[PDB]
Amino acid sequence: SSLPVSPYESEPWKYLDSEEYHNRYGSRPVWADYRRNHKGGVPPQRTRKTCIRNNKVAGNPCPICRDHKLHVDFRNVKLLEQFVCAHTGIIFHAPYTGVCMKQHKKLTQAIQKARECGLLSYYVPQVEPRDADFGTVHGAVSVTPPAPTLLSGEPWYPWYSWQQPPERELSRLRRLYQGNLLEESGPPPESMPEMPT
Amino acid sequence: RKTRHDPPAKSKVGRVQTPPAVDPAEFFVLTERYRQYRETVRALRLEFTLEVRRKLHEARAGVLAERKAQQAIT
Amino acid sequence: KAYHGGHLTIRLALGGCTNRPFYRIVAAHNKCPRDGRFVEQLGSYDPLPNSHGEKLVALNLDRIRHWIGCGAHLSKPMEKLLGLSGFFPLHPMMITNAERLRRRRAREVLLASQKAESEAKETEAS
Amino acid sequence: EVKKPAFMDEEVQRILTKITGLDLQKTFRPAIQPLKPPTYKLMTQAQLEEATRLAVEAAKVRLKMPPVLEERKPINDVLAEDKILEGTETNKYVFTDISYNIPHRERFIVVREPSGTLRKASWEERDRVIQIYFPKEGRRVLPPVIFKDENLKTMYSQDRHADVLNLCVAQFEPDSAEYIKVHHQTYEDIDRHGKYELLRSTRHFGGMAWYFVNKKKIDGLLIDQIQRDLVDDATSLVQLYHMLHPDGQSAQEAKEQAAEGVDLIKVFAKTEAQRGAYIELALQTYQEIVTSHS
Amino acid sequence: PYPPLLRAMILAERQKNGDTSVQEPLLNLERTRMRPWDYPAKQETKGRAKGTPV
Amino acid sequence: PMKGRFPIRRTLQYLGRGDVVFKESVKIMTVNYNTYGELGEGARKFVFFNIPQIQYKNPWVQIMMFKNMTPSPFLRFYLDSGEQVLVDVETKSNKEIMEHIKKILGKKEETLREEELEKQQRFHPGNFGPRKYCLRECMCEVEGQVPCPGLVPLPKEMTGKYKAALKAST
Amino acid sequence: RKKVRPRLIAELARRVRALREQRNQPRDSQLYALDYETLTRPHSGRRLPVRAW
Amino acid sequence: ICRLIGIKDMYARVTGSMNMLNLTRGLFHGLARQETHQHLADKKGLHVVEFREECGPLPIVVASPHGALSKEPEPEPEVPDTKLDWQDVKAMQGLKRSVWFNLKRPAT
RNA sequence: AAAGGUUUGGUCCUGGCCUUAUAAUUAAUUAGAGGUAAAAUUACACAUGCAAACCUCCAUAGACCGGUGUAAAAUCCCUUAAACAUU
Ligand code: FES
Ligand SMILES: [K+]
Ligand SMILES: [Mg+2]
Ligand SMILES: [Mg+2]
Ligand SMILES: [Mg+2]
Ligand SMILES: [Mg+2]
Ligand SMILES: [Zn+2]
């Protein structure tokens, strides 16, 4: 239950420049000398879900998991570059490098974060402006003449407001619905009453 | 949902209508709102009905329609 | 299915997942299923506030006018959306419901004031 | 009144195209993208020259400069104020007309606020919702995080100014404040560090020189063009500076002396140059090298 | 008057087409006036109940 | 190895290289050619190379070919009005024959482009639906909108299970 | 095709049913009869709405 | 064998008999009798130009004739008589490939 | 398919079978919690409850929605005419 503690946790990029890294890896990628154990000639289309379960390590730890000092961080661009095609700029699928699915998901997120912050370079296509004409004189983006009701402060339509029915009309309805009536309602409040708190 | 040939429920033989109670002041105001609202919406549906037919006629027998027809024959 | 009778209608077709509703505004024969065969999609309605706190309605106002000109009815929820946008007048029940809510909050405020006055009587008793 | 020259004026585009330059190797540098096996054709010297001509035609369309516009003015128009609906809704509604055949700057995008006010959508709301319903390849619905000053400084250290600008054209509108802010920040960093060569043979060189001329700080670009033996370009820059500032002391001095060619640059040094002493020194050294060697 | 949005779309079209005017768009309600809800209906086109007893 | 001579003729790219799209008037194109001779070489090459391309772009036009019925090869088009357009292709290259028929009875590039745009009028990018017809199935896919509950669990207060418990509690 | 066989019984039923309807058409005295004690129509057993009682 | 030679990027298919010796002899036979661009330029006297889709229309000259450059353009037939293999053409015709084709594999 | 194993004393050719990949159903052994999608032996017989009303009477609706894969090489695509139990 005691996984080793890396000295480069704070500054992961340092490891890739240290002598220890060069001796172990040289100038080849960290996954160059890894081979996966599987039955048959065609391998499974997914790699193992994870190499480390509850501080225990699987039989053939993947390139990232086998080396604890290797850290998948967006700031450690030199490591992330090894998992991206230099010619096509595509992130390799997990079977290509043999990383486990857990680290591959972690690697993909770090590369995407590094690109967004500008630490890791990528190809930006040249695109034309969205609009052929850049005029801003149409009413949609301009000022429409204020409507007469809007200037006066009245409702847009007269029936939006409460118009007290004539007294004769209120009596006509009390006769039609005699015996099934509700208390008469007056004009509603002019504004929305502030919610009690 | 049931078909017309299905039998009615026995739990629901007793049912009789219980019409809602009417507020005279709000019922009248609402009745007039529906009348004026439906008149405004009928005027707009007619205006939209005319734009559809104007556009259709221009395409079928507009200036541009006739010129292209003769241009092809020539 | 081979329908007999009915009319074209503009309504909201419910999509999305559980607790995540999303609507497609569509023109469809009224007898068709809610999420089934339609004639044209006329927009979408997202009833959940987004990151900016905005409920997003999309309306193809050019095609909507075309189908209203051909007899297409409108569902009551769609009439409310067109009223909020400003393309249609506010629906009668949108105004009535707003008035009912105003009268109901006035009562609550009055009751709270009466309770505070009753609490004031308790304060007087000490 | 003599019209102020515009960015798209046929004369300004001529000078800006010339000083920008062309380089088929830089304009058509290989893209880091999914690749296909190359094709091969046997061509005579006549055919090869024809193909180089077509490449130069395409390089011109590739170098078309992006628009330089003034900052749009905030949209603050209230269509209606239906106070009956006050307090009946908690969140704003944003309604977008998505009829296909409307220019995006002529679409109606309105907002029904909780207070009941029906207003026109602001510029930020207009661009966001048009990306949601008319998505443009390269643009994101929410503003990316690369345009933050700290992140932009990272791109500048890596000499990736042409990408910062290529990204600013995919995301923002030319008249937006964010667009102007990012462009003016890239042009200013190029100035301080004299990295004018990064944007040569690119569509972004015209806007950079335009910005310096309008801001009366072409000194660095002249010193850099002279040191690279591009003294025909430097003269055209001083002509563009004498065109957008006709009443300037430098423009009036060149009329008095009918200066041309290298004379125009010497006039600029004495009259309006912020760092005239250096322009003459670099110009003098260039003349010495040209005269001494040839 | 026209609805708030539909009025702005009409005035915007005027300016685009070069028609300069400050006239307020107005809907005509005369052509489409509704009968009362209790107005007698056409009996000739109304249905009749069937002859199968329940 | 693909069978037959010039197997490139049996590729979709070759069939799509045809440029003669006949006007709606054209209904039938009879091809009278001779299998032996010297002045009919272009006609024989036209039947070999071009007739497939013409049929591919004009599926509703009846192309019927007759062999060694006349001294010289010719093309005769039958129009819907009842007009008959006779073309004489003797001493003419197969390419020349294609260019001639394109001019007299071929639709122009402007017309064909207009028809293409009209076909796609009802596709809208904003429309949501299945992948076959639309870019995005749901608004959850859009950035800034509430994500799908399957991918990202919704807040408890936005769930009917939680709201029902409160209503019971009230 | 040609295996879509004719349906004589279906055609016979349609005509026969239609004929019986014309012969045994009900009258206004029967369709609109009412039982005033229960306010229910005997022909269909439909109870009138409460607002009409 | 490709790793031994130094080839890094290539596709190959082997059909018929899988005899290892005939595959080794056939591989070296074909790889040793190929034609470099410089050889083709000398044989035909024309420039050999390369067009990459990632470089646009930019013409790239990969080999120029050693002696005298010709002025007669190479004949371009309207319809080439090349003999095409059905397996290659079958992909562009829209026919379905096998479930075993282009599966995810480790870096080679 | 980037293929592999397996005829012989041995080699080569031809040729089948099988292996390696992917997914669904069931079964053995085994499993905490949460979110989501889908739920499926049987056109076999069905206990019970519910699934169509509305409404000032006339009418309208119960022809839909929902279900199953019965029958049938049954269809797809397209042309013409006509109504529509409609708006
Ligand atoms: S698919 Fe959009 S909410 Fe689930
Ligand atoms: K075998
Ligand atoms: Mg009635
Ligand atoms: Mg089981
Ligand atoms: Mg159904
Ligand atoms: Mg069956
Ligand atoms: Zn691992």
- Residue A89's CB: how many other CB atoms inside 10 A? 15
- Using the structure block, give the residue that is written with the tokens 């005939």: H22
> Which two structure tokens, joined as six digits, stand for F12?
């979709």
Q: What amino acid occupies position A88?
A: T
Element of type H or E holding F32: strand F26-33
- F with E: 3 or more CB pairs under 8 Å? no
Distance CA F26, CA D34 (A): 45
How near does any CA of chain B get to the CA of E26, in Å?
10
Q: Is G42 exposed, middle or buried (0-12, 13-18, 19+ CB in 10 A)?
A: middle
Check CB contact under 8 Å for C103 and A185.
yes
DSSP D219-282: HHHHHHHHHTT-HHHHHHHHHHHHHH-TTSHHHHHHHHHT--THHHHHHHHHHT-TTHHHHHHH
Sheet containing H47-51, strands listed edge to edge, beginning at the edge strand earlier in sequence: D39-43, H47-51, H60-63
* CA distance readout (Å), D279 to B68, D219, D226: 65, 7, 8
Whether C15 is in the pocket of ligand 1, judged by its Cβ within 6 Å, is: no
Q: Which of A134, A135, A147 sits opposite D174 (nearest CB)?
A: A134
Give the CA B71 to C1' I62 distance in Å.
59
> Which two structure tokens, joined as six digits, stand for D243?
């065109």
Dist. CA E38 → ligand 3 center (Å): 7
Distance CA C63, CA C39 (A): 12
* CA distance readout (Å), H20 to H13, H16, H25, H30, H37: 14, 12, 9, 15, 31
- Residue D250's CB: how many other CB atoms inside 10 A? 20
Distance CA F63, CA F22 (A): 12
Give the CA B2 to C1' I47 distance in Å.
21
- F with C: 3 or more CB pairs under 8 Å? yes
Q: Which of A170, A150, A175, A168 is nearest to A160 (CA)?
A: A150
> Which two structure tokens, joined as six digits, stand for A164?
């007290």
Dist. CA F133 → ligand 1 center (Å): 17
Distance CA G30, CA D2 (A): 97
Give the CA E48 to C1' I59 distance in Å.
8
In angstroms, this model's resolution equals: 3.1
Sheet containing C40-46, strands listed edge to edge, beginning at the edge strand earlier in sequence: C73-74, C8-17, C20-29, C40-46, C54-59, D92-97, D109-112, D117-120, D78-81
Angle at F32 between CA F26 and CA F38, to 5 degrees: 135
DSSP chain A: --PPPPTTSS-HHHHTTSHHHHHHHTTS-TTTT-----SSSSPPSS--S-SEETTEE-SS--HHHH-SS----TT-HHHHHTTB-TTT-PBPPHHHHT--HHHHHHHHHHHHHHHHHTSS---------S-S-----STTTSPPPPPHHHHHT--SSGGGS--PPPHHHHHHHHHHTTTSB-PPP-PPPSSPPPPP-
* CA distance readout (Å), F23 to C87, F19, F58: 44, 12, 9
Distance CA A49, CA A66 (A): 15
Helices D262-271 + D276-293 axis angle, to 10: 150
Whether F136 is in the pocket of ligand 1, judged by its Cβ within 6 Å, is: no
Q: Is F128 exposed, middle or buried (0-12, 13-18, 19+ CB in 10 A)?
A: buried
Q: Specify the 3-state DSSP secondary structure of C108.
A: helix
Ligand approaching nearest to the C-alpha of H17: 2
Distance CA H80, CA A134 (A): 49
* CA-CA-CA-CA torsion sign (B29, B30, B33, B39): negative
Q: Which of F2, A182, A61 is nearest to B19 (CA)?
A: A182
Q: Which atom of ligand 1 is the closest one to the Cα of F139?
A: 2
Whether F4 is in the pocket of ligand 1, judged by its Cβ within 6 Å, is: no
F26-33 and F62-67: which strand pairing?
A: parallel
Dist. CA B7 → ligand 5 center (Å): 22
How near does any CA of chain B get to the CA of A130, in Å?
29
- Structural contact between residues E27 and E6, judged by C-beta atoms closer than 8 angstroms: no
State in Å, rounded, how far the first CA of chain H is from the last one.
12
- Structural contact between residues D142 and D110, judged by C-beta atoms closer than 8 angstroms: no
Helices D262-271 + D249-257 axis angle, to 10: 140
* CA distance readout (Å), C113 to C86, C102, C119, C122, D103: 38, 17, 9, 14, 55
Distance CA D93, CA C46 (A): 10
Q: Which atom of ligand 1 is the closest one to the Cα of F140?
A: 2
Give the CA C66 to C1' I51 distance in Å.
38
- Structural contact between residues F21 and H102, judged by C-beta atoms closer than 8 angstroms: no
Check CB contact under 8 Å for B43 and E6.
no
Q: Which of D146, D141, D144, D100 is nearest to D124 (CA)?
A: D141
Q: Specify the 3-state DSSP secondary structure of C10.
A: strand
Q: Specify the 3-state DSSP secondary structure of F20.
A: coil
> Which two structure tokens, joined as six digits, stand for H55?
């470089």
Across chain B, how many H-helices and E-strands are there? Answer: 2, 0
Query: Which residues lie below 8 Å from residue A64, measured CB to CB, with a gap of 6+?
Result: A30, A70, A72, A99, A100, A103, A107
- Residue B31's CB: how many other CB atoms inside 10 A? 14
DSSP structural state of residue D180: H
Helices D10-20 + D231-244 axis angle, to 10: 150
> Which two structure tokens, joined as six digits, stand for F142?
């859009």
Q: What amino acid occupies position D65?
A: M
How near does any CA of chain B get to the CA of C116, in Å?
31
Mutate to test the interface with E, among A144, A160, A172 (most CBs of E within 10 A): A144
DSSP structural state of residue D3: P
Distance CA F129, CA F139 (A): 10
Q: Specify the 3-state DSSP secondary structure of E11.
A: helix
> Which two structure tokens, joined as six digits, stand for F49?
């190379």
Query: Which residues lie below 8 Å from residue E12, measured CB to CB, with a gap of 6+?
Result: A138, A139, A140, A144, D106, D108
- Structural contact between residues D117 and D78, judged by C-beta atoms closer than 8 angstroms: yes
Q: Which chains touch C (3 or more CB pairs under 8 A)?
A: A, B, D, E, F
> Which two structure tokens, joined as six digits, stand for H88?
């290659």
Distance CA A91, CA A93 (A): 7
Q: Which of F118, F137, F119 is nearest to F127 (CA)?
A: F137
Mutate to test the interface with A, among E6, E16, E21, E23 (most CBs of A within 10 A): E16
- Residue H1's CB: how many other CB atoms inside 10 A? 10
Sheet containing F84-88, strands listed edge to edge, beginning at the edge strand earlier in sequence: F62-67, F26-33, F74-79, F84-88
- Using the structure block, give the residue that is written with the tokens 């908690």: D90
> Which two structure tokens, joined as six digits, stand for A191?
């504004």
DSSP helix, strand, coil percent of chain B (3-state; round to 5): 65, 0, 30
Distance CA C38, CA F128 (A): 13
* CA distance readout (Å), B48 to B18, B29, C7: 41, 29, 18
* CA distance readout (Å), B19 to A179, A182, B25, B28, D72: 11, 13, 18, 17, 59
Query: Which residues lie below 8 Å from residue D2, measured CB to CB, with a gap of 6+?
Result: D246
DSSP helix, strand, coil percent of chain C (3-state; round to 5): 40, 30, 30
For D82-111, letters b (16+ CB in 10 Å) and e give bbbbbbbbebbbbbbbbeeeeebbbbbbbb
Read off φ and ψ for residue A95, nearest 5 degrees: -55, -25
Element of type H or E holding H78: none
Strand I, nucleotides < 7 Å from a protein CB: these are 1-5, 12-14, 19-22, 34-37, 49-66, 72-75, 84-87
Distance CA H46, CA H65 (A): 6
- The alpha-helical segments, DSSP class H, found in chain F are 12-16, 41-45, 51-57, 94-105, 109-119, 160-169
* C-alpha D244: how far from chain center: 17
Query: Which residues lie below 8 Å from residue A180, measured CB to CB, with a gap of 6+?
Result: B19, B20, B21, B22
- For chain H, state the CA radius of gyration: 19
Distance CA C16, CA C10 (A): 19
Read off φ and ψ for residue H22, nearest 5 degrees: -65, -30
Kindly report which amino acid residue has its CA closest to the C1' atom of nucleotide I13: H17
Q: What is the dihedral of CA H108, A85, A107, A78, to 10 degrees?
A: 110
Give the CA H101 to C1' I41 distance in Å.
37
Provide the residue count of chain E.
54
- Partners of residue C21 on adjacent β-strands: C16
Characterise F31 by phi-psi region: left (phi > 0), alpha (psi -120 to 50), beta (else).
beta
C40-46 and C20-29: which strand pairing?
A: antiparallel
Maximum C-alpha span of chain E: 70
Q: Is D116 exposed, middle or buried (0-12, 13-18, 19+ CB in 10 A)?
A: buried
> Which two structure tokens, joined as six digits, stand for D134?
């008319």
* CA distance readout (Å), A118 to A14, A71, A107, D171: 20, 19, 16, 16
CA atoms within 13 A on the CB side of G10: 3
How near does any CA of chain C get to the CA of E11, in Å?
14
For A145-177, letters b (16+ CB in 10 Å) and e give eebebbeeeebbbebbbbeebeeebeeebeeeb
Q: Which of D163, D151, D148, D135 is nearest to D31 (CA)?
A: D163
The experimental technique used to determine this model is cryo-EM
Choose which residue among F131, F134, F138 to substitute to test ligand 1 binding: the one with the highest number of ligand atoms within 8 A of its C-beta.
F138
Distance CA A160, CA A148 (A): 16
Distance CA C103, CA A189 (A): 7
Q: Which chains touch D (3 or more CB pairs under 8 A)?
A: A, C, E, F, H
Long-range contacts (CB closer than 8 Å, 24 or more residues apart) made by H76-84: H78/F49, H78/F95, H79/F6, H79/F8, H79/F9, H79/F14, H79/F49, H80/F8, H81/F5, H81/F6, H81/F8, H82/F8, H83/F1, H83/F2, H83/F7, H84/F1, H84/F2, H84/F7, H84/F8, H84/F11
Check CB contact under 8 Å for E27 and B35.
no
Nearest nt to the CA of H104 via C1' is I21
Dist. CA F93 → ligand 6 center (Å): 60
* CA-CA-CA-CA torsion sign (H24, H25, H26, H31): positive
Distance CA A73, CA A65 (A): 14
F74-79 and F26-33: which strand pairing?
A: antiparallel
* CA distance readout (Å), D12 to D125, D231, F46: 34, 18, 54
Q: Which of A87, D31, D24 is nearest to H59 (CA)?
A: D24
- Structural contact between residues C94 and D87, judged by C-beta atoms closer than 8 angstroms: no
Read off φ and ψ for residue C24, nearest 5 degrees: -110, 120
- Structural contact between residues D171 and D144, judged by C-beta atoms closer than 8 angstroms: yes
- Using the structure block, give the residue that is written with the tokens 């992006």: D66
Read off φ and ψ for residue F17, nearest 5 degrees: -75, -15
Read off φ and ψ for residue A19, nearest 5 degrees: -65, -35
Mutate to test the interface with A, among B16, B18, B23 (most CBs of A within 10 A): B23
- Using the structure block, give the residue that is written with the tokens 């044989």: H43
DSSP D65-114: PPP--PPPPP---EEEE-GGGTTS-SSEEEEEE--TTS-GGG--EEEE-T
Distance CA D266, CA D156 (A): 33
- B with G: 3 or more CB pairs under 8 Å? yes
Element of type H or E holding C96: helix C92-125
Distance CA C63, CA B26 (A): 37
Chain F positions with Cβ closer than 8 Å to H:
1-2, 5-9, 11-14, 49, 95
